[PDB]
Amino acid sequence: MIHFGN
Amino acid sequence: MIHFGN
Amino acid sequence: MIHFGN
Amino acid sequence: MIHFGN
Amino acid sequence: MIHFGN
Amino acid sequence: MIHFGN
Amino acid sequence: MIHFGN
Amino acid sequence: MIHFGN
Amino acid sequence: MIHFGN
Amino acid sequence: MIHFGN
DSSP states (O other): OEEEEO | OEEEEO | OEEEEO | OEEEEO | OEEEEO | OEEEEO | OEEEEO | OEEEEO | OEEEEO | OEEEEO
């Protein structure tokens, strides 16, 4: 998983 | 998963 | 999954 | 996991 | 895990 | 750009 | 850019 | 840039 | 940049 | 930069 934000 | 935002 | 937005 | 944000 | 933020 | 392949 | 492959 | 591969 | 591979 | 590999 690459997660940017909320 | 690549997730940008909410 | 590539997800940009909400 | 790479996580930037909240 | 790489975590930047909260 | 989203690029999968070569 | 999101790039998977070569 | 998110790059997976070569 | 997030880079996995070569 | 986050770099995993060579």
